Amino acid sequence: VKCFNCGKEGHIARNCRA
């Protein structure tokens, strides 16, 4: 719950759109 990488409250890290 919440993006490991990027902080943002949405999506999982692994293929995050960052």
Ligand SMILES: [Zn+2]
């Ligand atoms: Zn992210």
